[PDB]
Amino acid sequence: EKAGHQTSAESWGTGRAVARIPRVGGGGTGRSGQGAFGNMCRGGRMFAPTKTWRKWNVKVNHNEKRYATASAIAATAVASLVLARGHRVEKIPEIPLVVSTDLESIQKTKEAVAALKAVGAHSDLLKVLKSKKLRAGKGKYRNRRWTQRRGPLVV
Amino acid sequence: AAQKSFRIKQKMAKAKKQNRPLPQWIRLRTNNTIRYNAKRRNWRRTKMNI
Amino acid sequence: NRKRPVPKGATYGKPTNQGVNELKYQRSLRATAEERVGRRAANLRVLNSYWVNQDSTYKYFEVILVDPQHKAIRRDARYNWICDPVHKHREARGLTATGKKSRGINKGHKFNNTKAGRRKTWKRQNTLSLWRYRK
Amino acid sequence: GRVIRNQRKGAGSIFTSHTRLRQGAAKLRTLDYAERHGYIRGIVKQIVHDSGRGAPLAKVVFRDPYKYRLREEIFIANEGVHTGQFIYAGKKASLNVGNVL
Amino acid sequence: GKGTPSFGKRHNKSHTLCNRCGRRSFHVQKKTCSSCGYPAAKTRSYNWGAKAKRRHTTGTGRMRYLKHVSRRFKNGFQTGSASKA
Amino acid sequence: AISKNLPILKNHFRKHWQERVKVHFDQAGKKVSRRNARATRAAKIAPRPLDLLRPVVRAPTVKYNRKVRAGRGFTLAEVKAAGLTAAYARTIGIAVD
Amino acid sequence: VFQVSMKANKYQIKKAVKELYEVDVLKVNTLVRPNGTKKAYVRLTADYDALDIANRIGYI
Amino acid sequence: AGVKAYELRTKSKEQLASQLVDLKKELAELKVQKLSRPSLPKIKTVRKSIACVLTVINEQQREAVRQLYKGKKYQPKDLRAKKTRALRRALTKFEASQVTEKQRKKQIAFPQRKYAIKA
RNA sequence: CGUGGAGGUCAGUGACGAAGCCUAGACCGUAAGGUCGGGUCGAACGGCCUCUAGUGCAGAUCUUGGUGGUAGUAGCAAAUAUUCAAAUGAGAACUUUGAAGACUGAAGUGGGGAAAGGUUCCACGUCAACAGCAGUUGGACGUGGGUUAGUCGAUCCUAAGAGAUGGGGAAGCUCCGUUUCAAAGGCCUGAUUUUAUGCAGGCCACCAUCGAAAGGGAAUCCGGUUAAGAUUCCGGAACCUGG
RNA sequence: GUCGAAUUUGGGUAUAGGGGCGAAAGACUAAUCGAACCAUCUAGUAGCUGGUUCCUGCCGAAGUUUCCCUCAGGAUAGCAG
RNA sequence: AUAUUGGCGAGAGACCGAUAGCGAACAAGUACAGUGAUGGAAAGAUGAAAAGAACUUUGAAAAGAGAGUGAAAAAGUACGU
RNA sequence: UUGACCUCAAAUCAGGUAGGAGUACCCGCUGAACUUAAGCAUAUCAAUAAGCGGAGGAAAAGAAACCAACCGGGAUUGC
RNA sequence: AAACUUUCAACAACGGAUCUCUUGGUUCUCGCAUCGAUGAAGAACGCAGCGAAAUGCGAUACGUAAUGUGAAUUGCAGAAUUCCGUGAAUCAUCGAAUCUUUGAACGCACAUUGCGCCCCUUGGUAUUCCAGGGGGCAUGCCUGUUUGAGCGUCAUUU
Ligand SMILES: [Zn+2]
């Protein structure tokens, strides 16, 4: 909130052959006489500085939230949509793919992966493995350094 | 002034000892950044204002 | 009254702020007594005070003081509450009986502006409360 | 407007009297016990010039009735008073020039 | 003659080095420092002087004693010495 | 200023309102704290039910007198009728008023 | 000629020079050097010679 | 090299005082030869050795006073606790836990009963 | 159409060369633009579907920074003035020495100080920058040396004045006041020679303190000495204060 | 011009901003004076001046009515999308 | 149960990316200005590793030309592009 | 003559205690104007900024000289 | 026809944009309560084998003691036994100390490294003078102690 305003700069007015922007006073610095307080000034304050009471979350009707979850569930049983999203279900026998309850009690990762490869998720687990790439911007060093695909959703 | 108080002469002594270039072994230290004495003073350039 | 300490009565403002003489100093005279005594003996704790006499010029009060360093006070749990650091200069902050009279600290509709603190009440109803899911 | 000059005189910054060369306050003796029952004899040591004052001042020496010392007073000179004149100050002093009846 | 010729008569220092802050702001004739208020008991500061408060506040110095209080708090103000464990 | 057909608005924003603005970013964080406090308090009073028994009571204000509501305390006459003393009832989790 | 502490006066310099080197001091002249230190000019009595104890101290 | 504190703690009051003086004699000589030799790093060890002896001497004298003032109130201020100015002015456990005889009777007659609600 | 970031996808491109930059080389679009080839380069970056914004410049005597024409131009002209030879150096109108000619002309361009400066003092080495030409020279640069007091000053006294205390105002920060409506102290003589000092006594009434390197004031002169210090060092000869 | 005095001047000291100081000019009060400098209120307000950043497509004005301490501005009807 | 632009200790972001983000990513409230209150900068990047150019030659010297190190001197402490 | 009591003093008397810093939040005092009102003085800005006094880990308030008018509720604080 | 001017390209300059980074900033959330007369925050001046600053420290001075780890520090020099260990280290931890001159700053002052009083002790043939070492001397207020003052006032005697 104090950015661009920690200075006592004042306008020089007209008659000095300079623009009427406020200027840092005093002398002997190399900063004295420079423009201040404007969005066009170096080291000034930006136009409409960002506030925290901007709206960050959005409220959606609860019944509309459930509407979209129902359609999302239904769209998971359409093999045309699943392929269109790129989920490598060409060799999958049938969808909805329902497996036995014994998957719910697997404790080790190696056994869990083997069950996934046995039912037809082999080509989709390799899809995520082969899709690891660096991010394409400054988000790399904002704790978002990597990106990859999304595999199956076990329920 | 020739007749001077002790505080002035004591600050004068400290300022005389700071009137020095960098030691030349400082530049060879690992990850050294300092290249010169950026706080050098001269009697003819800048006054102490003490 | 409290004469406004401006040189030659010049206030340099609007006419409503031109009063100099008949302004009344929201704190009581008894509060001024405990404050001036409380500075004289800073090792003590002001407990209460009462009226003894008055004339045209001065009003006279007696101040009750408690020593928080005396072992007869640090023991005797009925009185050792005054020894807590949260009770430093009760008269300065208006924690004395007359301090809460002037502060308006009381119960009811007649004290709506001052029931829990005037600054606290004003700041609470002059604040913009915004939630994550805007109401 | 601006504060006028006669208003600046009451602050007493550069309008205080110049009192560096003045001999002293020209006061009579103290009416203690001798001047109201009898008299006391003094002597005019000198007449001097007080800077800032038109009249000359007379330095008169009395004795202390209660201690062995030589209390000295500064009188405004009445003309005709000379050095070495005897001044009688008291209730029973005679009607003569320089006395303090 | 208020310009260059008048600037040649400047040899009488109005301020000298202070003892509380050592800033060369101690007025010789007022016997007061214009920065910290010496010899007054309180150090001069103001709320309109936000930069001024920032320039001499706690932490700008060595903190010869206060820099260790938090460590002594963490160990619960322990007394004695380690037992050669 | 005034302009085409619109309702007259009263936006009380002519003070330094931006100094006092509360945005509750901690709604989620403060809810975890509230539940952690209940979990920690429950252990300290480990057998006790974490709240006092409260009476049922008629509401005031004929707009609301048609309902009953949880009161504050059990009305010293009532605890005596129940066969116990208020000084003792306060010790076994009964709220007395 | 010694570099003495900046708190030591002429009395202390006399007693120390006698204590540390077992000599007699005729007079002590002290100046504060421009570098912020003190220099003592200790003149010995005619009985001793500073040359015979400068090399005894170890500097020559 | 240098002196070891665990060694110095065995020596007596006069042994350490004579030890300290000998270390001042040595460091005085090293300052003389430092003006001649280009570099004399040995002077640090003697300087640290001097500080170690004065530390052990100070501990012996301070601990002796602690025994002298043991088992009585009004010990020297630098010998007693330092914790905090506010902590030192606080009520003690005995003073904080003072209870009136009226409140003591109620605190044993009607304590908080550890009850439960299951059946 | 284009830019920063975000969710999904192309199991997209890439150290066998990403991005960026340059290219009167090529192609597509009315256009905002997109694609390709070549060079330079070194580590990340794109196509498509959506989401988000501190999202597109020729101007604002806009801000910060850099750069021209003017332009090798205006100009480097007050204070009488320089000349010859040698030495040094790579280099001499400017440095050193010698010779000659001049000036300040004792209310000086001489010899000292106060204020201010602070090491500029002196020496050795030395010319990248400074000395608006130049420079071997310098108040420049680098490295060291140098300031010695009983008698000179401060310190002490008071001046104009400043300012605690006792008090009295002021919400308070603080203001008035300097002896005021105050119970405001130590100096000499001595005495028990358990013994230190309370007692044997007498005296005393002002009254904090700060305020002058030109006011007042205890007392030092001569000769010699250093690269640079001297009424201070050395030699000799004196004086004051306290005991 | 004056040049032995209502002279010139050093140091110390006092007088501070609606205040000082002025043999008086609104002069001087640190190159600042018909009210100094500094920071903050303060991004003070401005019916007034200047500027306001990509392409293409379609449509396309007004300087007129009434009211206004209104006349360099607004509301209102009209014209346009 | 409530507040918390300070202190201490932590975890994060559809935030900024060296004319930005705090004035300050650096010996930053530093250099510097002002009598003073106060004002207040600029300034990040060789290379994986100095391996920071031995040696010859021209020059009084700075440096030049070779030679050499390096993946690259179209990276030479005036250093990524 | 002696001993009290009351009031008032002194001591480098024996133990303590206050002052300053920080001050985001807290309790008080004191207190504007810019600004809006298309001018402006009441009003507004604002019982705000600046200034002063005093705390803590929270502070304050707090167990009715309360709210109510109902079939009454029942300390304080916060949403 | 050259020179010169303008345009374009290549190479080289000037300048430091663009790209790619980032031990920094900003915002949100969570937890805790800990400055000072037992002398704080702040200041001045010093301290290293070779340092001007930053950081650290106080004449025990880039620090002493204690504990943990367990073989370094590093620009150069130096030291080696500190290497199967009460032990290296510009390490971590930190409970014992040191802590100059100051600062609310406290013997009086302070544009002065100025001027005192008291106790113990040492030297100068010294209870009085000078010097060295150690320890003290602010104000307000509170509880208590001792010594007092006031025909304020109570009993008993000549
Ligand atoms: Zn100061």
From Swiss-Prot, chain B:
One GO cellular component term: cytosol
Query: Is Ion transport set as a keyword in this record?
Result: no
Main localisation, per the record?
Answer: cytoplasm
Q: Where is this region: Disordered?
A: 1-21
Query: Which GO biological process categories is it annotated with?
Result: cytoplasmic translation
List localization entries.
Cytoplasm
Q: What does the UniProt keyword field contain?
A: Cytoplasm, Ribonucleoprotein, Ribosomal protein
Q: Does the keyword Protein biosynthesis apply?
A: no
Q: Which GO terms describe its molecular function?
A: structural constituent of ribosome
InterPro entries in the record: Ribosomal_eL39, Ribosomal_eL39_CS, Ribosomal_eL39_dom_sf
Basic residues: which segments have biased composition?
6-19
Task performed by this protein:
Component of the ribosome, a large ribonucleoprotein complex responsible for the synthesis of proteins in the cell. The small ribosomal subunit (SSU) binds messenger RNAs (mRNAs) and translates the encoded message by selecting cognate aminoacyl-transfer RNA (tRNA) molecules. The large subunit (LSU) contains the ribosomal catalytic site termed the peptidyl transferase center (PTC), which catalyzes the formation of peptide bonds, thereby polymerizing the amino acids delivered by tRNAs into a polypeptide chain.
**What does the subunit comment say?**
Component of the large ribosomal subunit (LSU). Mature yeast ribosomes consist of a small (40S) and a large (60S) subunit. The 40S small subunit contains 1 molecule of ribosomal RNA (18S rRNA) and 33 different proteins (encoded by 57 genes). The large 60S subunit contains 3 rRNA molecules (25S, 5.8S and 5S rRNA) and 46 different proteins (encoded by 81 genes). eL39 interacts with YIH1.
What family is this protein classified in?
Belongs to the eukaryotic ribosomal protein eL39 family.
Q: Write the protein's name.
A: Large ribosomal subunit protein eL39
Swiss-Prot record, chain D:
Q: Name one GO cellular component term.
A: cytosol
Where are its TM segments located? none
Domain of life here?
A: Eukaryota
Q: Does the keyword Cytoplasm apply?
A: yes
Subcellular location(s) of the protein: Cytoplasm
How does it associate, per the subunit comment? Component of the large ribosomal subunit (LSU). Mature yeast ribosomes consist of a small (40S) and a large (60S) subunit. The 40S small subunit contains 1 molecule of ribosomal RNA (18S rRNA) and 33 different proteins (encoded by 57 genes). The large 60S subunit contains 3 rRNA molecules (25S, 5.8S and 5S rRNA) and 46 different proteins (encoded by 81 genes).
Other noteworthy facts: There are 2 genes for uL2 in yeast.
Q: What is this protein called?
A: Large ribosomal subunit protein uL2A
Q: Which residues of the full protein are shown?
A: 2 to 102 of 254
From Swiss-Prot, chain E:
Which residues make up the binding site for Zn(2+)? 18, 21, 33, 36
Under the heading PROSITE patterns, the entry gives:
RIBOSOMAL_L37E
Location in or out of the cell: Cytoplasm
Q: Which cofactor does it need?
A: Zn(2+)
Start-end of C4-type zinc fingers: 18-36
Which GO molecular function, any one, fits this protein according to its record? Answer: RNA binding
* Keywords of the record: Cytoplasm, Metal-binding, Ribonucleoprotein, Ribosomal protein, RNA-binding, rRNA-binding, Zinc, Zinc-finger
Remarks, miscellaneous: Present with 21800 molecules/cell in log phase SD medium. There are 2 genes for eL37 in yeast.
Q: What does this protein do?
A: Component of the ribosome, a large ribonucleoprotein complex responsible for the synthesis of proteins in the cell. The small ribosomal subunit (SSU) binds messenger RNAs (mRNAs) and translates the encoded message by selecting cognate aminoacyl-transfer RNA (tRNA) molecules. The large subunit (LSU) contains the ribosomal catalytic site termed the peptidyl transferase center (PTC), which catalyzes the formation of peptide bonds, thereby polymerizing the amino acids delivered by tRNAs into a polypeptide chain.
What protein am I looking at? Large ribosomal subunit protein eL37A
- Which organism is this protein's natural source? Saccharomyces cerevisiae (strain ATCC 204508 / S288c) (Baker's yeast)
Curated annotation (Swiss-Prot), chain F:
Q: Which residues form a coiled coil?
A: none
A molecular function GO annotation: structural constituent of ribosome
Q: Work out whether the entry's keyword set contains Ribonucleoprotein.
A: yes
**Which biological processes are named by the entry's GO terms?**
cytoplasmic translation
One Gene Ontology cellular component annotation? Answer: cytosol
Which cell locations does it reside in? Answer: Cytoplasm
State the superkingdom: Eukaryota
Keywords associated with the record: Cytoplasm, Phosphoprotein, Ribonucleoprotein, Ribosomal protein
Record's family?
Belongs to the eukaryotic ribosomal protein eL13 family.
Relay the record's extra comment.
Present with 133000 molecules/cell in log phase SD medium. There are 2 genes for eL13 in yeast.
What task does this protein carry out? Component of the ribosome, a large ribonucleoprotein complex responsible for the synthesis of proteins in the cell. The small ribosomal subunit (SSU) binds messenger RNAs (mRNAs) and translates the encoded message by selecting cognate aminoacyl-transfer RNA (tRNA) molecules. The large subunit (LSU) contains the ribosomal catalytic site termed the peptidyl transferase center (PTC), which catalyzes the formation of peptide bonds, thereby polymerizing the amino acids delivered by tRNAs into a polypeptide chain.
Record-given protein name? Large ribosomal subunit protein eL13A
